[PDB]
Amino acid sequence: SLRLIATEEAVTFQPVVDALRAHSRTDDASLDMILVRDVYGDEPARPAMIGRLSDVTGERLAEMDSNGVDMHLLSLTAPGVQMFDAETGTRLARIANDLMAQTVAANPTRFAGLGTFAPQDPASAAREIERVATQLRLNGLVINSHTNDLYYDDPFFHPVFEAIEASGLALYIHPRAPSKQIDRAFRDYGMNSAIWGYGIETSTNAVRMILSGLFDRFPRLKIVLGHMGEAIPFWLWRLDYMHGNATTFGGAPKLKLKPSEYFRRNFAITTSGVESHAALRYSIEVLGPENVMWAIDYPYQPMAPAVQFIRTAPIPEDVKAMVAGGNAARIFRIT
Amino acid sequence: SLRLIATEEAVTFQPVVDALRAHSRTDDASLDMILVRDVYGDEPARPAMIGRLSDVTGERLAEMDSNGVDMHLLSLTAPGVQMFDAETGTRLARIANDLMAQTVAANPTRFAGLGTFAPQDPASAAREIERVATQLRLNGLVINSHTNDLYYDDPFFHPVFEAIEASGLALYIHPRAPSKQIDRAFRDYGMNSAIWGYGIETSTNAVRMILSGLFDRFPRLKIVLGHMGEAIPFWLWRLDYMHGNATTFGGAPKLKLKPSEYFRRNFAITTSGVESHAALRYSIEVLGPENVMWAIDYPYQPMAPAVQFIRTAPIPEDVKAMVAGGNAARIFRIT
Ligand SMILES: [Mn+2]
Ligand SMILES: [Mn+2]
């Protein structure tokens, strides 16, 4: 009876897989090359991952059925098309988006989809964002933190955000590995990945977006952050408290709202990879129950424990319905 | 009659101030130079700060009295003596520690103190840690995240942690601005400081310490983190979950315990700069009430709101007493 819509569910498609296979052989210094080699490289350390990522109607659907999961909201897996040059990224984003729409239409009661884009070329990205919203009628958008080691405060990306805001599509900002601005401290102990780097990279991106005033410029933007908001919900009081010093002594711009007010107004979060009732309850309290969505983070996380996490959450049934799927249905235009 | 012991209370002394005024004029590229110029520069943007940091028995004690604060646990303010060359840092650490001991001894019912050291020279730091523990009988230790842009998983610092463990003194790892490994992303919107950079720098340091197996090598270390544990308490589930991948594919060493188990066994946290009852409640729930301590972060934060934050906390009186001062009395050897 509980409607479950998992909102951070990765997929890939052959043309992107082939491109990453070739890219894995190059001398790119980006920290994502660790993942890219492990999954897409010759002699990969994780040889089953491409199969599990590519599968939609086999193991994925059987697991959804076994666990009573109604839908996956699908996204091209990190690092998407962002590691390629502008020309290649742009070509592949179109291809990946068409394949995403095709995948969704084969089973639209079970799958919804986010389109992606190649912000290496902001004008072409804005055009693809319009095409995703209007021509393909996809459910929203996904991008994997930084592009070209720049964050989304940079005015270079204004045409992208202008297009996103006009489109009405929410943007899921998924992690990728720490950019070159920060990667040096994430080369050890597997910290390049989900264990630490992903969170630091993505949250820092989001915080720069807020403090730069991007949400005064584009106030109707809706951003979604996985991994219980990449911990930003935990830092809200300190973000607010220290903002006066930042504008006064630090040369940060004056904002109309407080940092945490942008977070509640313009962001929503998902529970991907943070199956903690305590953290879920914290987030509901400080963000409000309309701002928290459930996710699995399949195939990197197994479905069963993610499902049982939300089914057993110590919150009222109406709030649980919102988190399990009601909020996603609203935010990602799912019927 | 609630005993209030504030655990992250900054102070400075003339010999360190003079050293930092001189350092302010050098071409050090450290991100801390923004703070150092602002407070200690020839043309300071924050001219009253040196006076406020230096004052112990004037305005500080008066504010403590007005607000019913029993004690401050004093620490040489960031960046301590860690920006100097090895010889200079070593010399000033001894001098700062002697002055701290004398300051505590002058009003020992109102002030406790943490000694510091210069990790630039691990062998010399080890000796000063022993002196601090055995001869000055100070209450514990303080260091400001990185030294020379290295983190405390580095085996270079092993003689330091060997000494700390043996001394039985708890080490407060206070923030510093992001090291050169990560500072590129923290040059804008005032993010070098408390609003964002501090927490990312310090939490990353601690996470590296945990994942490197430092607490299998030194299982009796006690580390204290301010700012509600630099958000580490929020990330515990994901740290644990992803640790399997880190060791299997990421070359992280195999640990005896889970990451969150080191966090609970070897760390305690304080509420400095995070006056959120919701964040406080979360922390007590996931760490246990014995691992959370109150702090003010004076003079960077005012006393009254921090005091009223704990006096009004929606927790039982016995738990409130532990947080307000009881835990600190145990952890920092205060009668
Ligand atoms: Mn994911
Ligand atoms: Mn402090």
Side-chain angles (χ1 to χ4, degrees):
Chain A
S1 173
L2 183 69
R3 186 184 197 188
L4 283 169
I5 302 178
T7 56
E8 201 189 296
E9 315 312 314
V11 66
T12 189
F13 311 102
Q14 268 307 300
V16 178
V17 167
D18 296 336
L20 284 170
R21 281 226 177 82
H23 192 85
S24 78
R25 300 186 183 102
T26 66
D27 69 357
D28 194 336
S30 169
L31 191 59
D32 291 286
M33 288 300 273
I34 293 168
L35 168 66
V36 167
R37 291 183 166 107
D38 282 357
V39 171
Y40 303 97
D42 303 322
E43 289 159 48
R46 309 180 76 182
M49 188 59 42
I50 286 175
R52 299 222 306 129
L53 284 160
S54 301
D55 165 68
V56 176
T57 60
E59 180 200 335
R60 184 190 300 254
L61 190 59
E63 278 279 307
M64 292 170 57
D65 286 340
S66 290
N67 292 284
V69 175
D70 193 41
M71 306 180 76
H72 278 199
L73 170 62
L74 303 175
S75 46
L76 176 61
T77 187
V81 301
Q82 291 154 259
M83 300 191 70
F84 310 128
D85 61 33
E87 215 153 20
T88 300
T90 297
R91 299 193 358 254
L92 289 175
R94 297 188 51 98
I95 296 289
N97 294 338
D98 289 336
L99 286 174
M100 177 70 78
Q102 182 175 298
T103 298
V104 169
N107 291 285
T109 64
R110 305 308 297 278
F111 301 105
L114 302 178
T116 197
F117 49 91
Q120 299 94 296
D121 177 345
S124 298
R127 286 191 254 106
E128 179 65 3
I129 284 157
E130 182 55 28
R131 194 179 70 98
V132 160
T134 302
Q135 306 306 309
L136 295 183
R137 315 227 269 234
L138 286 173
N139 296 88
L141 298 161
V142 61
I143 203 66
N144 308 288
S145 207
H146 83 88
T147 299
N148 293 336
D149 306 293
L150 299 180
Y151 297 108
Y152 297 128
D153 60 301
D154 189 321
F156 181 66
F157 300 110
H158 285 183
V160 176
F161 291 99
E162 181 181 43
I164 294 174
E165 189 193 37
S167 77
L169 299 183
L171 176 65
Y172 206 123
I173 300 181
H174 189 275
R176 59 183 289 196
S179 75
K180 291 180 187 186
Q181 305 198 24
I182 57 166
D183 67 17
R184 285 162 60 188
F186 302 85
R187 297 280 185 176
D188 300 302
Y189 321 128
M191 290 171 67
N192 69 91
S193 191
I195 203 176
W196 196 243
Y198 281 9
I200 297 311
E201 157 72 16
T202 308
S203 64
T204 294
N205 203 341
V207 167
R208 293 178 61 102
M209 292 166 76
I210 297 177
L211 300 186
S212 74
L214 185 73
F215 301 105
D216 278 348
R217 184 173 296 271
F218 306 109
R220 296 295 303 280
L221 280 179
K222 180 73 81 204
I223 306 307
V224 178
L225 293 178
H227 318 107
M228 207 64 77
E230 313 288 358
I232 296 169
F234 201 67
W235 292 102
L236 298 177
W237 193 92
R238 184 145 166 92
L239 285 164
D240 285 348
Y241 182 85
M242 283 301 171
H243 191 237
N245 274 1
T247 58
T248 301
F249 310 109
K254 317 283 183 169
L255 310 177
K256 293 177 175 179
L257 309 182
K258 299 184 183 186
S260 71
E261 291 170 350
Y262 292 108
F263 196 79
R264 293 182 202 93
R265 186 186 75 172
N266 292 102
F267 290 72
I269 69 164
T270 84
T271 68
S272 53
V274 181
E275 300 167 10
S276 160
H277 290 155
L280 171 59
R281 275 178 28 251
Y282 173 83
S283 301
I284 295 173
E285 175 177 0
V286 304
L287 299 184
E290 292 170 286
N291 273 356
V292 186
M293 292 178 280
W294 175 75
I296 301 169
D297 220 343
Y298 183 87
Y300 307 96
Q301 301 267 342
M303 289 197 216
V307 170
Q308 300 165 17
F309 156 70
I310 188 59
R311 290 195 196 281
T312 62
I315 55 187
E317 285 298 290
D318 53 8
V319 172
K320 183 186 294 167
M322 304 167 59
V323 176
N327 292 333
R330 175 182 70 255
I331 291 163
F332 296 110
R333 320 175 166 194
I334 300 167
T335 294
Chain B
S1 175
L2 176 75
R3 188 185 197 191
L4 284 165
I5 301 172
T7 54
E8 199 188 295
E9 315 313 313
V11 68
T12 189
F13 311 99
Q14 262 308 314
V16 177
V17 173
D18 289 337
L20 282 172
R21 285 217 197 89
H23 200 82
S24 77
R25 310 173 186 118
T26 70
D27 49 43
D28 194 333
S30 173
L31 193 60
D32 287 290
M33 288 300 280
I34 297 177
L35 161 66
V36 172
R37 290 184 215 109
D38 289 351
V39 173
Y40 309 89
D42 285 335
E43 187 214 305
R46 303 243 277 168
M49 190 56 57
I50 288 182
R52 299 248 290 151
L53 288 167
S54 297
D55 162 66
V56 177
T57 61
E59 184 211 312
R60 183 190 309 247
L61 187 58
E63 286 280 300
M64 289 163 66
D65 289 341
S66 303
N67 292 285
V69 180
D70 193 40
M71 300 186 75
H72 279 201
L73 175 63
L74 298 172
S75 47
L76 177 73
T77 191
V81 300
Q82 300 158 243
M83 304 198 62
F84 313 119
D85 66 76
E87 179 170 287
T88 304
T90 297
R91 195 174 69 255
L92 289 166
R94 308 239 298 179
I95 280 169
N97 290 340
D98 289 337
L99 290 169
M100 176 74 72
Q102 297 166 14
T103 294
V104 170
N107 287 286
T109 69
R110 306 308 296 282
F111 300 107
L114 306 177
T116 199
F117 51 92
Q120 298 89 308
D121 179 2
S124 295
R127 304 190 232 105
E128 178 66 0
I129 284 172
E130 300 176 47
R131 195 177 76 91
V132 157
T134 293
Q135 297 308 133
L136 301 179
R137 307 186 215 268
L138 284 169
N139 298 86
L141 296 163
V142 58
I143 197 66
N144 309 286
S145 204
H146 79 92
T147 298
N148 301 328
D149 303 296
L150 302 169
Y151 298 107
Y152 299 133
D153 61 303
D154 194 308
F156 179 63
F157 298 112
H158 281 178
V160 172
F161 294 99
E162 182 191 38
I164 299 190
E165 193 197 30
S167 81
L169 292 181
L171 175 65
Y172 205 126
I173 305 189
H174 185 281
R176 220 199 130 152
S179 77
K180 289 186 198 175
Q181 302 189 41
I182 60 166
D183 66 11
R184 265 172 60 190
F186 299 84
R187 294 269 176 187
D188 300 295
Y189 324 120
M191 294 170 65
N192 66 93
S193 181
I195 198 172
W196 196 246
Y198 278 8
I200 295 307
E201 156 69 16
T202 308
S203 60
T204 296
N205 201 344
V207 171
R208 296 177 65 99
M209 292 169 73
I210 296 172
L211 300 181
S212 74
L214 185 72
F215 304 98
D216 280 350
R217 186 177 296 263
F218 306 111
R220 302 291 301 279
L221 282 178
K222 181 68 77 206
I223 308 296
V224 174
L225 296 171
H227 319 109
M228 210 65 70
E230 313 286 0
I232 297 176
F234 202 64
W235 287 102
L236 292 185
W237 193 93
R238 184 155 171 76
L239 286 166
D240 285 352
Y241 182 86
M242 286 296 171
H243 189 236
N245 287 346
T247 53
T248 298
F249 312 109
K254 304 293 280 305
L255 308 181
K256 284 176 194 172
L257 305 182
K258 292 183 201 66
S260 71
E261 293 170 349
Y262 296 110
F263 196 76
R264 288 184 204 88
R265 188 186 72 172
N266 294 99
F267 291 71
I269 72 166
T270 87
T271 68
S272 54
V274 184
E275 298 166 18
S276 166
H277 293 153
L280 176 57
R281 174 192 309 113
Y282 171 84
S283 293
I284 295 168
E285 173 180 359
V286 308
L287 304 183
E290 285 164 297
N291 283 346
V292 182
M293 290 175 278
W294 175 75
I296 299 171
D297 218 351
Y298 180 84
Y300 303 99
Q301 308 249 354
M303 306 203 200
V307 168
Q308 295 166 20
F309 156 72
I310 187 58
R311 291 198 196 281
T312 63
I315 55 184
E317 289 301 290
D318 51 13
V319 180
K320 194 189 287 167
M322 295 158 66
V323 173
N327 295 327
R330 171 180 70 258
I331 290 170
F332 297 109
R333 308 177 171 198
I334 298 172
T335 304

